[PDB]
Structures are given as C-alpha cells and as structure tokens.
C-alpha cells in the first residue's frame, strides 16, 4: 500500500504460493521488488520485479524428494 505498484501486479499470485514465509520475508519480497524498479530507473513496481524479487528472497532449496509422497 505504501509502494507505487502497477495495476498489472496481482498479489494473489505470490500469496497463493505454498511457501511458508514470514512478514519479514514478505517485506523483503516487496523491498526487493522496489530494488529492481530502482535499478531500472523506475518508480513503479511491475509484475516482473515482484516475480524476480519473490524468487530471490525465497530461494528455497527443494529439500524434499518426490518419492516420499
């Protein structure tokens, strides 16, 4: 709400993910989303910044093999 988002950003894409993340994680995702916008000399965070920020912040190694289920 404090960030200049674009209307193309759908926050439900990252909310619905099954990653068990904290508020600091969510703050980091949004924080890095504006990091990419700042890097590209932008002031509006598009969906691609959020997609890259989410992937970088989570960086969850699989740590679970599929044959267990």
């Amino acid at each position: 709400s404090k960030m200049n988002l674009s209307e193309e950003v759908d926050l439900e894409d990252y909310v619905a993910r099954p990653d068990k993340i904290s508020g600091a994680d969510i703050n980091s995702i949004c924080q890095e989303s504006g990091m990419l916008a700042v890097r590209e000399n932008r002031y509006i965070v598009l969906a691609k910044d959020f997609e890259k920020a989410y992937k970088t912040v989570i960086k969850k190694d699989e740590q679970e093999h599929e044959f267990y289920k």
Partner: protein, 242 residues
C-alpha cells in the same frame, strides 16, 4: 534428522520414515559436476548437457552423456559415470527384450518405469546401494507425441514438459518453469534454443559448439540423433544474433 541403528548405512527406515542411503544417492548426481536439461516441444524433444574435457589428452569423442538406448529412444545420463553406463546397458537390454517379447517398440513411459522398478529394489534390499545416477529419456510416442521422463535413483519417475537433473537442476527448473508458464508450443528450433539457453543462463558459459551435447527426437523423424558440432553451432549463432 533422528537416527536409530544402521538407518544411515543401509536402506532401512529412519525414526521419522526417511531412507538416508537413498537420499545420499541423490547427492551423487551432483558429484560429476554436470547439468542436463531436457525440453519437450510440440513435435520434438531435446536433451542438452554440458561436456567437459579437462585436458587435450582425453578423446573428446568418448566423453558423452548422451546415449542411444534405442533407434527411437535416447537418454542423457547425469551423476556417476560408471553407474550411468550400467543403467544404459540395462535400459538397452529391457528395450530389446520388450521388442522381442511384445513385438513393438518400448514406450518411453514404460522404459523408465522398468528402470525405476529396477532401481527401487536397490532401495529395499540392503545388500546393494542405489545407483547414484539420474536418467532422462526422450522419445516420440505413436500417439502421445514427444515424451520426456526423468528416472531418479529412488525409482521415482514422471513425465516432464521440461526437466533438468544435475548440479544446477533447481536453478534450471525455475528457468524452464518461467518459460512453460508462457504457454508456447515451441517449434524444434525454439525447443533447442530454450534447451541451450536454460543450460547457458544458469551456468553462464556462453557455449561454444564443443562444450554441450544436444540430442533430439522429432515427429517427422522419430529417431535419436546426436547434433554435430556444426549443427550445434547453427543454434548458438542463431541464439547469439537475437
């Protein structure tokens, strides 16, 4: 990560229900230091892996993780080289036995399902260790079309539109996941390009036509062929010019 007895030394359950020996076999896939990428298009399937020849003394024509299991089925092996060859020889035997016993070429789904079945016995019997290798088959089915199947040390197997196994499997999975989300039925050229790009973007190598092996199967020619250095150069030139 609790332990009780020999649950770390033989394929028996841990207190929390884990086969550590089978898990340790997965880490053996990364021992070779190579990453394999398989991408399935609308009418083709491509397996691409990096080839490393540390010294000019080694015959580069013999360093191949791409194996022609059948005339119409080919695989890319990642992990321990010795264990990989054993699976390939076994896969060739089962493919030949299927043709003899049943009269038609073995489906790709059934080929690894037997290999996954063979590798599962190693995960139940404690006298042998699981093979520290991962097998990715590609082949054109009569009806289902292009197929890509990974074949893990634990006997797990699944169909894949785009899979990868090796050191950079998780980083290459994310790249392929992003591309398939775009929902484009790639042509043969795009599928090779996205296969080469996936290995290139994750490893950051900017491949020469001597550091990657590309094997393709197409609907028009349902035969497994190893791309020549000249043929790989054509895709590398095309990728660079865009």
């Amino acid at each position: 990560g609790s332990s009780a007895g020999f649950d770390r030394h033989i394929t028996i359950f841990s207190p929390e229900g884990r086969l550590y020996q089978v898990e340790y076999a997965f880490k053996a896939i990364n021992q070779g230091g190579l990453t394999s990428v398989a991408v399935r298009g609308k009418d083709c399937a491509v397996i691409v892996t990096q080839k490393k020849v540390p010294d000019k003394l080694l015959d580069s024509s013999t360093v191949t993780h791409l194996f022609k299991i059948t005339e119409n089925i080919g695989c890319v092996m990642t992990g321990m080289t010795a264990d990989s060859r054993s699976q390939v020889q076994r896969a060739r035997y089962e493919a030949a036995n299927w043709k003899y016993k049943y009269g038609y070429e073995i489906p790709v789904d059934m080929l690894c399902k037997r290999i996954a079945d063979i590798s599962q016995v190693y995960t139940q019997n404690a006298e042998m260790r699981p093979l520290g290798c991962c097998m990715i088959l590609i082949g054109i089915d009569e009806e289902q079309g292009p197929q890509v199947y990974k074949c893990d040390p634990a006997g797990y197997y699944c169909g894949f539109k785009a899979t990868a196994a090796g050191v950079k499997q998780t980083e290459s999975t994310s790249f392929l996941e992003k591309k398939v989300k775009k929902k484009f039925d790639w042509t043969f050229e795009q599928t090779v390009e996205t296969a080469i790009t996936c290995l290139s973007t994750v490893l950051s190598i900017d491949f020469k036509p001597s550091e990657i092996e590309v094997g393709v199967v197409t609907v028009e020619n349902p035969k497994f062929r190893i791309l020549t250095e000249a043929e790989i150069d054509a895709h590398l030139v095309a990728l660079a010019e865009r």
